[PDB]
Structure formats: C-alpha cells, structure tokens
Amino acid sequence: GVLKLPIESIHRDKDQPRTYFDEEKLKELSESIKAQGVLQPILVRKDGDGYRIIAGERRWRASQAAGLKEVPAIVRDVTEVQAFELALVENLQRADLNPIEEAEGYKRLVDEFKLTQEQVSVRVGKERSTVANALRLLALPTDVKGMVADGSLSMGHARALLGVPRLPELQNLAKQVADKKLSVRDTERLVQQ
Amino acid sequence: GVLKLPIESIHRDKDQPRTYFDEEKLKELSESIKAQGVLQPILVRKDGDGYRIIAGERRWRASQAAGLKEVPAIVRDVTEVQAFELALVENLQRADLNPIEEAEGYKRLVDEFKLTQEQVSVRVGKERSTVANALRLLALPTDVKGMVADGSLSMGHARALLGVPRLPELQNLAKQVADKKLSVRDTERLVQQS
Ligand SMILES: Nc1ccn([C@@H]2O[C@H](COP(=O)(O)OP(=O)(O)O)[C@@H](O)[C@H]2O)c(=O)n1
Numbered sequence: 001g002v003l004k005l006p007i008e009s010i011h012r013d014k015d016q017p018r019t020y021f022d023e024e025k026l027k028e029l030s031e032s033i034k035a036q037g038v039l040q041p042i043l044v045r046k047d048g049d050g051y052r053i054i055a056g057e058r059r060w061r062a063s064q065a066a067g068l069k070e071v072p073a074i075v076r077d078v079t080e081v082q083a084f085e086l087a088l089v090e091n092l093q094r095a096d097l098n099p100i101e102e103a104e105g106y107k108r109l110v111d112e113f114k115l116t117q118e119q120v121s122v123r124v125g126k127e128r129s130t131v132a133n134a135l136r137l138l139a140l141p142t143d144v145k146g147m148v149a150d151g152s153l154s155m156g157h158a159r160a161l162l163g164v165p166r167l168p169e170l171q172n173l174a175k176q177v178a179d180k181k182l183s184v185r186d187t188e189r190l191v192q193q
Numbered sequence: 194g195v196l197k198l199p200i201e202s203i204h205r206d207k208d209q210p211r212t213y214f215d216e217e218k219l220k221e222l223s224e225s226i227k228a229q230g231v232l233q234p235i236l237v238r239k240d241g242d243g244y245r246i247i248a249g250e251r252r253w254r255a256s257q258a259a260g261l262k263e264v265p266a267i268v269r270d271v272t273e274v275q276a277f278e279l280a281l282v283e284n285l286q287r288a289d290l291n292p293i294e295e296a297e298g299y300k301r302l303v304d305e306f307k308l309t310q311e312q313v314s315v316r317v318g319k320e321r322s323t324v325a326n327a328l329r330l331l332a333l334p335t336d337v338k339g340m341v342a343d344g345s346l347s348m349g350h351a352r353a354l355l356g357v358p359r360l361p362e363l364q365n366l367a368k369q370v371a372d373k374k375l376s377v378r379d380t381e382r383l384v385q386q387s
C-alpha cells in the first residue's frame with residue numbers, strides 16, 4: 001500500500017502537466033505539512049535510480065521545504081500514457097470548498113473546538129490574513145453570503161461591501177453589484193457613501 | 194497502509210465542511226473512476242459499527258455511482274478536532290492547473306500519445322465540450338494565453354476573443370479587455386464590431 005519513500009529517492013517528471021509553481025501556495029502547503037504531515041500519498045513510478053512522480057510534485061517539494069526526509073507514496077506500475085492520464089485526473093477531478101464553506105470551517109474550529117484564530121492558521125497552514133478575512137465574510141447577511149458562496153460576488157467584491165454602514169443598504173448595493181456585474185473598482189466607488 | 198473497505202461499511206460525516214455537492218462534477222468524478230479507479234485513498238475514522246469519512250465524501254459517492262463495491266481508504270486514529278482540521282487541509286491546500294496547462298495536457302494526449310479527443314474525454318472523465326473548448330484556447334496568441342494562464346482573461350473573455358479574425362487586433366482587444374477589466378458582455382460587443 002503506502003510506502004514511506006526517501007525524498008531523495010524521488011525525482012520530478014519534467015514533462016508533467018503543471019509548469020507554474022506558485023511559491024506562496026507552496027509555502028502554505030509546507031506549513032500544512034508541518035502541522036499535519038502529508039495526508040494523501042503521492043503517486044510515483046519506478047524510474048532510473050529511484051522513482052519518478054506521477055502526481056504530487058507540490059507535496060514532494062513542500063515536504064522537502066519543511067525538512068521532512070520521507071514522503072508517503074503509492075507505487076503505480078503504469079505506462080507513461082496512463083501515468084500522464086493519472087496526473088490530469090488527480091488535478092482536474094476536484095471541487096473546492098466555496099468561500100462561505102471555508103469560512104464556516106474556520107468558525108467551527110474557533111467556536112466549537114475552541115481554537116484561537118492563530119491556532120486555526122497554524123493547524124490548517126493558511127495565512128492569518130486569509131483566516132481573518134474569511135471569518136469577516138460571516139458578518140454579511142444571508143442573501144449576501146449566498147452570493148459569495150455561489151460566486152455571484154467575488155472575494156474582492158465582498159471586501160468592499162464590508163465597508164457599507166447600513167446592512168439594508170449593504171444588500172441592495174450588493175445585489176446591484178452582482179446583478180449588473182460591476183467591477184471591483186466600481187463597487188468601491190459605490191461604497192464610499 | 195491502504196485498505197480496500199466495502200463502501201457499505203463507510204458512512205458520511207454529517208458535520209463535514211462541504212455542504213454543496215455539484216451533481217455534474219460528481220458525474221465527472223464517477224466517470225474518471227470508471228476509467229482509472231480511485232487514485233487517492235479516502236481518509237476515514239472508525240465510527241459506530243463501520244467507518245466515518247474524514248475526507249473523501251465525493252470519491253465515496255462517485256464510487257457507488259460507478260458501481261464499485263469497495264474504495265481505497267486510510268484509517269486514521271484522530272480526535273474529532275484533528276479530523277475536521279484534516280478535512281479542511283485536504284480541500285484547501287491545493288492548486289489547480291490553469292486553463293492553458295489543462296488544454297496543453299489534452300493536446301499532449303492527442304498529439305504525443307495519439308488518443309482521440311473522444312478518448313481523452315473517456316480516460317480523464319471530462320465532458321466532450323470541456324475538452325474541445327480547452328483545446329480551442331490554444332489557437333490564441335502566446336501573449337493572450339499567458340493572460341488566460343494567469344487569470345487576467347477569464348474563460349468567457351477568451352471565448353469572445355476567438356471571434357476576432359485578425360491576430361493583431363485580437364491581441365490589442367485582449368490587452369484592452371484585461372487592462373480595463375471589461376465585462377464578458379462588453380468584450381463581446383467589441384468583438385462584433387471588429
Ligand atoms: N498537509 C497536506 C496538504 C495537502 N495535501 C494534498 O495534497 C494535494 C495537493 O494537490 P496539488 O495538485 O495542489 O499538488 P500536488 O502535490 O498533487 O502536486 C491535495 O490532494 C491535497 O488534499 C496532503 O496530502 N497533505
């Protein structure tokens with residue numbers, strides 16, 4: 001099943017589908033690995049003097065960055081066409097939590113499990129600013145949170161709308177922003193009142 | 194390590210962070226599982242007379258819909274608080290391929306590995322329209338698909354810009370749309386004039 005493989009025994013697939021590696025997101029992944037370890041084993045292929053990654057290059061890099069010496073892995077015996085299919089499937093067959101689901105998750109850790117916002121940040125590997133801003137979404141009214149949750153309003157839109165003094169005025173402005181589909185800049189000019 | 198657990202011995206976590214389950218995405222996941230199996234074991238906790246899911250409810254639902262009788266799983270002995278942390282980490286510590294990376298992946302399966310576009314849809318579990326539309330992005334000029342890659346141009350913005358007949362004017366609208374952050378509808382009106 002799941003081996004613990006030395007990181008030095010594993011090398012990247014130079015032809016893998018991901019070419020861009022966001023350093024800020026790699027940093028968060030590394031922080032989460034320090035807190036929780038790697039939760040899902042990477043997929044590798046025997047190759048050369050060791051193994052070649054099929055899927056899981058970020059996990060491998062982040063583990064290296066955190067100073068871990070091994071990474072959980074599943075060894076797959078596959079053709080390289082199938083290995084490439086696996087790399088696409090692993091990344092493309094996912095559904096993220098929406099921003100309200102994320103924020104309510106942080107809220108449960110604080111309210112129910114009695115973590116501080118600091119502890120949530122450390123335990124999940126997310127920046128303090130990300131945890132704090134998600135929680136602030138939950139001060140919005142239901143209708144407005146619904147528009148954030150379904151994507152009618154973006155993070156940036158929600159940012160600006162938190163400045164509106166009156167909640168009723170806040171909903172109507174939010175509904176226009178989503179309904180007419182205004183830019184974030186137009187929203188902020190609107191919020192100035 | 195990884196167990197094959199019977200699906201009927203696994204039940205969901207009613208307090209898990211995800212509350213919305215897109216049916217189309219579950220369908221796609223199920224088709225990918227029919228083609229490839231479950232690639233990443235789900236995380237479960239001993240609970241009642243079976244197991245509770247920590248992370249992986251979609252894989253579990255899709256496996257049932259695919260007709261599997263078992264699912265790969267890792268049994269974790271954790272507190273309730275740690276299990277909820279793991280559920281959040283599993284979903285929030287990810288980075289998607291950008292639209293161009295996705296499109297070039299389909300193109301490699303076709304050009305290098307000699308799959309048909311039909312087979313790409315089957316083997317990766319994506320709708321035929323999704324594969325076709327992604328591939329159509331690669332007709333855009335470098336500078337434009339770079340803006341698609343980094344999110345300067347949305348999917349709808351790219352769709353409209355494919356209607357521009359001349360590449361020099363396509364690039365100039367692309368910069369104008371991305372720099373001014375015009376709406377999709379506005380971008381469409383520009384394209385028709387051109
Ligand atoms: N501490 C962590 C954080 C994320 N993950 C998983 O690692 C994967 C990250 O996916 P990704 O496509 O961004 O990066 P790769 O490692 O696949 O290259 C997700 O499946 C996350 O659930 C983990 O196994 N352990």
Ligand SMILES: Nc1ccn([C@@H]2O[C@H](COP(=O)(O)OP(=O)(O)O)[C@@H](O)[C@H]2O)c(=O)n1
Pocket residue numbers: 089090091093094095096222225226229230231232233234248249250251252253283284
């Ligand atoms: N055939 C497949 C397709 C996706 N997956 C993985 O299953 C996970 C799906 O993530 P998700 O958050 O959308 O759904 P859950 O199964 O975690 O509830 C990703 O880590 C995908 O890489 C898999 O293991 N086998």
Ligand SMILES: [Mg+2]
Pocket residue numbers: 055056057090091
């Ligand atoms: Mg991946």
Ligand SMILES: [Mg+2]
Pocket residue numbers: 248249250283284
């Ligand atoms: Mg998940």
